[PDB]
Amino acid sequence: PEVQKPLHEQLWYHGAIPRAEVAELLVHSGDFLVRESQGKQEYVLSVLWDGLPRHFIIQSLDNLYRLEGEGFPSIPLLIDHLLSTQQPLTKKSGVVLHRAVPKDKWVLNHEDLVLGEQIGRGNFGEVFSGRLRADNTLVAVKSCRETLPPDLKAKFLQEARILKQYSHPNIVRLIGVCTQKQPIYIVMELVQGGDFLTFLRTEGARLRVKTLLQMVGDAAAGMEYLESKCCIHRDLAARNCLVTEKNVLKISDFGMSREEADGVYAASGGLRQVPVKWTAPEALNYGRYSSESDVWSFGILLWETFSLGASPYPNLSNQQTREFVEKGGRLPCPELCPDAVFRLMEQCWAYEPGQRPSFSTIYQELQSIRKRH
């Protein structure tokens, strides 16, 4: 029976989840969960009341857990008491429990995972290879440095929030989220061939034009899917795409990605290390991100592909690149780039976002070009 299970096996115990996720989960008055305060090193009962989460420290003495009333030898017993009696958590607050909010299917225990070697560094910190102990599934593990500013750490679970919703052959699969203890991890499929930029540079002259077109076609299919889900990626670049053992491309690094039903994300203005040279002018100038700015990014990706991993605007700083683009400046046609592909790239970088092609158009055009290779 449930109440006899340890706290760490309870459906309504959410461990090290951050406050922003708590606020997401607590929807109706009386919705609650129990978690660990990483700072205070105490258990906390978080409950929605008058529209906002309220956080109550669970006291312990003589191995009995309590608030301002009776004590119990376990937190599940305390929770059962409060729920069954409908007693306010404190006389002063009047807060009453109504509904235990359970973990979703994506939560993974730390004990389910073994971390391997570092494979990358992202904006939040290191990315590791790893394995699931139950079956030896190889995984990629995204971590978050503790010293990052609170406002940025609050964005760490965005990649998981987004990828939980998706399933497509050209988008990296989420496996789980390790939020029951610190350190918190996001666990994804391991795409064994690594990043596409390194692939282009390493395999270089071995790659046939037909293969290059299939790989950017994969990217285009991934982007068409994301658009269909109202997802604006914002960080599309060759180095953020991964290559499988069979040279299938998958889009990765969703940390910046935003879901917007009406198709436009207005940036905070506070983003650091913005990928300027991959970003559309309206996105930088006015903070307007959309699938149309992702199309701009896609044009840069196409340039990266057909240059076999050249660095864009190599003789310009980020500020100089913005000034260059405002003057009409664009990247030159790579030697190996078919005329039709360059024409498409040029359309991706139309100054006005409304003049850029759709991802469906891009995918169909790339496919038609490949069929003559």
Residue numbers in the entry: 449 to 821
Excerpt from the paper describing this PDB structure:
We have solved the structure of the prototypic SH2-kinase unit of the human Fes tyrosine kinase, which appears specialized for positive signaling. The three structures were determined in complex with the ATP mimetic kinase inhibitor staurosporine and were refined to low R factors and acceptable geometry. The SH2 domain, the kinase domain, and substrate apparently interact cooperatively to yield a functional Fes kinase complex.
This structure was well ordered, showing productive interactions between the SH2 and kinase domains, and we were able to trace the entire chain; we refer to this structure as “active. In this active configuration, the SH2 domain is stabilized by a sulphate ion, which mimics the phosphate of a pTyr ligand by coordinating a conserved SH2 domain arginine (R483), as well as R467 and S485. In addition, a sulphate ion is coordinated by Y713 and R706 in the activation segment, thereby mimicking autophosphorylation. The second major interaction site is formed by a network of acidic residues located in the SH2 helix αA (E469, E472) and R609 in αC of the kinase. In contrast, the sulphate ion occupying the pTyr-binding site of the SH2 domain in the active Fes structure formed a network of salt bridges typically observed in SH2 domain phosphopeptide complexes, correlating with stabilization and ordering of the SH2 domain and αC.
